[PDB]
Design a protein around this nucleic acid. Structure first.
Lengths: 71, 92, 139, 150, 42, 114, 214, 89, 56, 59, 179, 195
RNA sequence: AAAUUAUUUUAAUUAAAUUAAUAAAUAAUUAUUAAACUAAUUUUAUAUUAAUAUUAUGAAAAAUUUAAAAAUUAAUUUUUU
């Protein structure tokens, strides 16, 4: 946890602000919900269509430290 | 007591209920589940009464102002763990 | 608008309606199954309780005597042990999986003779219609 | 013979033959929903649904629309000439699962991409065929070459 | 379904059985109308 | 009553309730889908000991129709205990445990063991 | 009763938790001959750990019943879509063809799993645990592995639940499957750790005893 | 909140062997094995770009698994990314 | 096909030559049997001129 | 946000090329044209799958 | 909006006065008189036209003391299956044959039985001990019931013998190709 | 107990014999609504079940008009106050209830085209009120003995509650042997109407 | 306000809420283009979405509900190639 306190507190705020119309999961964050104005994981619109359709493994999703990326 | 006053319970474990529902609804499919379950909507009226048969009297009982404020010396002598004088209403 | 009365024939043919529904829900409260015995006949008369006004008894010129000809007749698979005596003879020709060829006397398999994609040249005609486009059954 | 018959007791289900006697377009959106789950839309349509429990409700809600008929399974194994020993969970284990209008996927697009790939696994079935001819000729062209030097 | 006992023994879906009073209640170890005719009927 | 547009946006997976039950089943906040039965045991012979521990009540919250009257012997609560402890002891193994209890101890009946 | 095999190092060792008649039998730890059939031994490995998610269906052996058991010959299972045993899919999305019969994969031995197929070049998910030396299955069905743990478990499933016609006399299925070693053993564990599960199936109080994810 | 004081049922015996019901948290949660598994920013694997040609093994299996004619080079020999002074560049 | 995202299987209408051509199927099957007759006879010069014939 | 790929610089028989994409993407609509090979519904992760293949093929 | 003029432009030749001369009134007339025919014809002509045919056969069944009320139901009793458009051809051009159908229904002759559903040949309940050379008892059951029916249809040259032709050797016509 | 959460109904031992549905009779224990019961414990018709009253209670006779009649509640009376309650619970349930319908009525005479059966009243008794009876007891009026109910709007018909003579039950119900079940036939189109 | 030019076709539907010195703007609908198969069941049955385009405030016969209504209003299933 101590390592996460820093990796979250040494991020320039702009890396946290709401940064795209589609939240990293795929929903469309409209206005009026102050909780969802914070987009920690950065979205990637043009990436990830191989997963969940071609039988590509969940092993590919994950990053180098093991935690999955979302698409 | 009064079916007009409701609470919202969130029980944190989602597997604790899912892995029972998937049974409770797999048992009652084979006709092997009993309908006197606590969670049955129409049984709760009788369920309480099988276990606590005089619960009406446990909430209807009016407390004398003596016992509602148990002897403050019993608090210094430590007999009663901590006096709560305002918590007087039985919300069951 | 509803001005002149419903003609009588309509009300009468609508009293047959509620007496259709009153005959559906008689079917939709039957037991989900029927505890039956192997040895006994299949349905010796054994209908539902539908002997309110029983008809078509004539055993011919009766609609059901293509079926109850065989139900009332003595049941051949007369025991659960007799079933395996009968169920151990049937094969499955096309099912997915492996087999044991020499189980027969001298038969030499077909699908390993004309390949898997080729089908026998069925004579196409009006009465005889064989399966068409066989390469669409592979899912 | 005045005796409860004695023997190993098999139980036989029932199979409902359902028809449609009233038009569907007069009824609600829920009653039309049940008829849809009985493969019934037009008047005079007819289907053969099982007597399993959640079908018994669907048929019940629309009793005023359909005309049911019940068949014990032995009274079905004879309606189509069937040997008594052959069950039905081996007869169905023979028909392919891709019968006419294979699946009912959640919307006519997902239908049209369930029929698409079905028309692809045909293309791939000939293409996995056409290279399996090459991969065997290639593995031989290797051995002809390899054993050439010996 | 009959193989995994999944077919219920009580005939008629839950909602249906509340609708029609001819499917008798499927009480087992009690009498339908409360107390049994303790009084001799005859 | 489920009126309102947001119930239209979230029953159907509309704009940002696009994966609406944001916590559906198949997530456990507590035990993260790993069985809580310690396999790291002092002696390898006794690793099979912890198998079959109750993770919750298993019996009351389900509400099965135990038609066993409370005066039966213990050996007639085995068909219930098993359905939650298979993968731990074969059914015919319980009937070796749920008999040594009846033989050795002074307990015989379901009412006694309660 | 005895069971030899061909022991190998650094291969996936995959286990089923076979259940029959509501009596959990145990755990049948297969090994997968990766060194010879790298394309097939992966398809099996992927369907036994729920790794590869949705293709045409829930690509996962957990729950699916042994639709075809023949006493003394084979113990077939799989057929993930329409579990009553008439389909064949791969994690790839199409029924791929068999790789090799050269050796160690074209020898159906009395303790060895082979990936059954409809037509020669159409391998899929349906396997079978060979129960005897079948010299007419050599060169045709590709051996994918071998049974390390619990031969008496499978030699029972064939007794209780097997009939000459092939269709089972009772119920039997795969109450659980997973990977217990080999290559990508832990690298699959990170693919399955966390709150939200990969696949959604009835609680393990159901699949284990009562019903086989029909 | 007031915590957990006014201690547990206040009974004692040799038996004392029937209860866990850790407060949910002290059961894989407050044994903080991996809850950051969901709440930690990912470190993405090598990314193929238009300019940066960083290969990845995780994708290369999804080709090495395929039933493809025209086989592919083995991964290690497909790598541009690994004795004067322990070998020069 | 004039549609793309619904009723679009009509752009990928495929009919296997093993259905709409029977003289081709046989020709593929004769040579396949000619592959196994040389497989037993061990005529590797022949199994090629079977395969290199069949693929063409 | 619905993407397609385009394989523009190929010569040879695209069909024996496109018949090797099908085995990769058994679910993406692939069309062949004179110069290119369009494969639909495949975004910048599919772009990454190709080059890990066009390197494996040795090009 | 396309009025199919060149499809009507030459067909005003059979309209009456003002319609033929001018065009925008000629079309308007015919593209209505045409637009009502093909609406009269789909939904209205039958349930009129098929009532002349019913009024004919009726009053031609009426001559023989029966009604349409009784004939329409006494035909389907005898499984006789003559569409009313045909009974009207018989009512007129073949009166005797029609009254033959009339006198049949009034007769108390047993109508034909409903067709029997398919039956289970009892050889399915024996297990042939599989010998290579002997046929299954259920095939030589089916065959004999398919060859006796092939000799049933049409006067042919096939082993032409009076009445019933030769069978017990017709079932074994494969040996005639044997060496 | 709180001023907000009050018992919606409370236990009560009746001393008098009240006619109304919430009413009881001599000596039975009943959970009647709180507001009603609270103006009984002041009125004297009822007393909360102290352990003393659970054996006997001095009920009331209109003869001398005072609380003299001692009605001791042994196990035998508790088999009498059950059958006498279970009886007049069917009474006060069908008499209080107003069982609705939805029917089709094409035509002018406001005539239900498929008129009602005594089957179709016991069916709407068990459906809505769960009152399970014999449809042989339901006597229709004179206007609807011929053709069934047959007409929209408010119809009523008599239900005969036979077994009320050994319960000593009169003057505490409006009619010892009958009860007016009160139909109503709310015509509806094929959308919501049956039959 | 009046018009807006090319038949033989090949996927369906209505909606009714925030606001208006009272309707060019928003939802919701419809539309164009495109999408991915999360437990629930039959071996049933399922138009769910994204992206853009969008000069709209009032729902037959019922079932009832406001109102002197003397209909309007709420209502909600229709709404023909």
């Amino acid at each position: 946890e101590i390592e996460a306190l820093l990796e979250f507190h040494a991020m320039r705020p702009e890396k946290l602000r709401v940064r795209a119309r589609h939240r990293p999961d795929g929903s469309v964050n409209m206005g009026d919900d102050p909780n969802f104005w914070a987009q920690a994981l950065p979205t990637r619109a043009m990436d990830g269509s191989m997963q969940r359709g071609l039988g590509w493994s969940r092993r590919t999703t994950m990053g180098a430290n093991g935690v999955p990326v979302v698409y | 007591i009064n079916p007009s006053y409701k609470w919202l319970d969130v029980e944190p474990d989602i597997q604790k209920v899912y892995r029972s529902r998937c049974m409770r609804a797999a048992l009652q499919a084979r006709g092997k589940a009993s309908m006197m379950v606590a969670g049955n909507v129409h049984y709760r009226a009788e369920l309480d009464h099988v276990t606590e048969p005089h619960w009406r009297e446990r909430v209807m009982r009016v407390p004398k102002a003596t016992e509602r404020f148990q002897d403050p010396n019993y608090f210094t002598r430590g007999l009663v763990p901590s006096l709560r004088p305002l918590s007087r209403y039985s919300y069951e | 608008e509803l001005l002149h009365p419903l003609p009588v024939w309509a009300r009468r043919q609508q009293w047959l309606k509620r007496d259709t529904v009153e005959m559906n829900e008689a079917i939709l409260r039957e037991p989900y199954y029927r505890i039956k015995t192997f040895a006994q006949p299949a349905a010796f008369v054994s209908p539902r309780v539908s002997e309110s006004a029983a008809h078509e008894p004539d055993t011919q010129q009766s609609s059901r005597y293509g079926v109850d000809r065989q139900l009332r007749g003595p049941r051949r698979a007369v025991s659960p042990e007799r079933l395996q005596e009968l169920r151990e003879q049937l094969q499955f020709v096309g099912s997915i999986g492996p087999k044991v060829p020499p189980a027969a006397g001298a038969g030499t398999a077909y699908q390993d003779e004309y390949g898997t994609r080729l089908r026998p040249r069925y004579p196409q005609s009006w009465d005889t219609v064989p399966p068409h486009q066989p390469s669409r059954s592979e899912i | 013979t005045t005796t409860i018959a004695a023997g190993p007791y098999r139980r036989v289900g029932n199979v409902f033959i359902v028809t449609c006697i009233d038009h569907p377009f007069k009824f609600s959106w829920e009653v039309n929903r049940m008829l849809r789950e009985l493969r019934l839309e037009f008047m005079g349509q007819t289907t053969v649904v099982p007597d399993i429990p959640p079908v018994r409700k669907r048929i019940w809600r629309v009793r005023h629309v359909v005309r049911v008929d019940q068949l014990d399974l032995d009274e079905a194994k004879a309606l189509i000439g069937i040997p008594e020993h052959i069950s039905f969970r081996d007869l169905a284990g023979q028909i392919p699962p891709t019968f006419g209008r294979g699946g009912s996927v959640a919307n006519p697009h997902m239908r049209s991409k369930m029929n698409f790939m079905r028309l692809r696994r045909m293309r791939l079935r000939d293409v996995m065929h056409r290279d399996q001819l090459e991969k065997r000729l290639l593995e031989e062209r290797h051995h002809a070459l390899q054993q050439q030097q010996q | 379904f009959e193989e995994e006992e999944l077919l219920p023994r009580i005939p008629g879906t839950p909602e249906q059985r509340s609708w029609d009073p001819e499917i008798p209640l499927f009480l087992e170890d009690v009498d339908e109308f409360g107390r049994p005719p303790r009084p001799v009927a005859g | 009553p489920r009126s309102g547009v947001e119930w239209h946006n979230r029953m159907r997976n509309r704009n940002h309730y696009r994966h609406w039950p944001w916590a559906r089943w198949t997530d456990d906040p507590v035990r993260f889908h790993q069985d809580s039965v310690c396999h790291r045991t002092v002696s390898a012979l006794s690793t099979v000991a912890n198998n079959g521990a109750p993770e919750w009540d298993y019996y009351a919250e389900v509400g099965q129709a135990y038609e066993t009257p409370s005066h039966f012997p213990l050996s007639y609560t085995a068909p219930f205990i098993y359905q939650y402890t298979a993968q731990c002891w074969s059914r015919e193994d319980l009937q070796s445990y749920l008999e040594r209890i009846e033989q050795s101890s002074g307990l015989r009946t379901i009412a006694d063991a309660a | 009763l005895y069971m030899p095999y061909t022991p190998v190092a650094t291969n996936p060792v995959v286990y089923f938790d076979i259940t029959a008649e509501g009596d959990a039998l145990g755990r049948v730890s297969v090994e997968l001959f990766r060194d010879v059939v790298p394309r097939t031994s992966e398809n099996f490995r992927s369907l036994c750990t729920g790794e590869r998610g949705y293709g045409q269906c829930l690509l996962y052996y957990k729950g699916t019943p042994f639709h075809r058991i023949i006493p003394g010959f084979v113990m077939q299972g799989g057929d993930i879509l329409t579990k009553d045993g008439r389909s064949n899919v791969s994690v790839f999305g199409y029924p791929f063809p068999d790789e090799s019969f050269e050796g160690k994969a074209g020898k159906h031995l009395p303790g060895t799993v082979g990936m059954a197929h409809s037509g020669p070049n159409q391998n899929g998910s349906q396997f079978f645990f060979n129960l005897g030396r079948n010299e007419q299955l050599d060169r045709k069905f590709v051996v994918v592995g071998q049974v390390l743990g619990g031969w008496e478990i499978v030699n029972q499933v064939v007794k209780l639940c097997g009939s000459r016609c092939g269709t089972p006399v009772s119920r039997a299925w795969i109450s659980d499957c997973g990977q217990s070693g080999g290559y990508m053993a832990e690298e699959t564990q990170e693919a399955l750790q966390g709150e939200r599960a990969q696949h959604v199936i009835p609680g393990k109080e159901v699949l284990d005893l009562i019903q086989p994810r029909y | 909140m007031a915590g957990h004081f006014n201690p547990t049922p206040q009974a004692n015996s040799l038996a004392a062997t029937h209860y866990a019901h850790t407060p949910e948290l002290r059961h894989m949660a407050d044994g903080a094995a991996m809850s950051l598994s969901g709440q930690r920013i990912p470190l993405l694997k090598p990314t193929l770009s238009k300019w940066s040609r960083q290969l990845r093994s995780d994708i290369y299996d999804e080709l090495l698994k395929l039933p493809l004619r025209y086989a592919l080079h083995d991964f290690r020999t497909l790598q541009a990314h690994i004795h004067a002074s322990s070998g020069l560049s | 096909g004039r549609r793309f995202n619904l009723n679009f299987e009509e752009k990928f209408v495929y009919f296997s030559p093993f259905d709409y051509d029977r003289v081709f199927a046989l020709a593929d099957q004769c040579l396949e049997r000619a592959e196994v007759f040389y497989q037993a006879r061990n005529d590797r010069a022949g199994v090629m001129r079977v395969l290199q014939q069949r693929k063409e | 946000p619905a993407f397609y790929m385009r394989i523009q610089n190929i010569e040879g028989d695209m069909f024996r090329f496109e018949e090797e994409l099908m085995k990769i993407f058994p679910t993406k609509k692939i069309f062949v044209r004179s110069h290119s090979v369009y494969v639909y519904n495949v975004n910048l992760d599919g772009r990454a799958v190709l080059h890990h293949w066009l390197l494996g093929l040795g090009f | 909006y396309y009025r199919a003029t060149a499809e009507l432009d030459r067909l005003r030749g059979m309209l009456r006065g003002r319609a033929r001369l001018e065009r925008k009134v000629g079309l308007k007339r015919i593209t209505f008189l045409m637009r009502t025919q093909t609406r009269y014809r789909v939904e209205q002509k039958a349930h009129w036209e098929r009532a002349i045919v019913r009024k004919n056969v009726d009053s031609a069944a009426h001559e023989h003391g029966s009604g349409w009320q009784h004939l329409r139901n006494d035909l389907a009793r005898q499984n006789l299956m003559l569409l009313p458009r045909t009974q009207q051809q018989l009512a007129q051009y073949e009166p005797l044959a029609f009254r033959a159908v009339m006198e049949l229904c009034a007769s108390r002759v047993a109508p034909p039985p409903p067709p029997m559903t398919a039956q289970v040949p009892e050889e399915a309940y024996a297990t042939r001990p599989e010998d290579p050379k002997v046929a299954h008892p259920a095939a030589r059951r089916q065959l004999e019931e398919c060859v006796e029916r092939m000799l049933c249809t049409g006067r042919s040259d096939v082993l032409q013998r009076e009445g019933p032709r030769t069978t017990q050797a017709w079932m074994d016509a494969w040996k005639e190709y044997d060496l | 107990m709180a001023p907000e959460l009050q018992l919606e109904y409370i236990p009560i031992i009746f001393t008098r014999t009240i006619l109304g549905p919430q009413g009881g009779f001599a000596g039975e224990e009943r959970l009647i609504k709180r507001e009603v019961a609270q103006k009984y414990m002041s009125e004297g018709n009822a007393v909360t079940p102290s352990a003393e009253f659970h054996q006997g209670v001095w009920c009331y006779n209109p003869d001398s008009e005072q609380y003299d009649r001692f009605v001791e509640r042994n196990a035998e009376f508790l088999d009498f106050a059950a059958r006498k309650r279970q009886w007049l619970d069917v009474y006060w349930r069908v008499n209080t209830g107003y069982l609705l319908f939805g029917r089709q009525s094409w035509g002018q005479g406001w005539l239900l085209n498929c008129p009602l059966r005594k089957k179709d009243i016991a069916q709407k008794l068990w459906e809505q009120y769960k009152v399970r009876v014999d449809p042989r007891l339901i006597e229709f009026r004179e206007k609807d003995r011929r053709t069934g109910i047959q007409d929209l709007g408010h119809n009523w018909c008599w239900l005969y509650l036979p077994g009320a003579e050994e319960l000593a039950i009169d003057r505490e119900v409006y009619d010892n042997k009958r009860v007016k079940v009160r139909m109503h036939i709310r015509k509806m189109s094929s959308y919501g109407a049956l039959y």
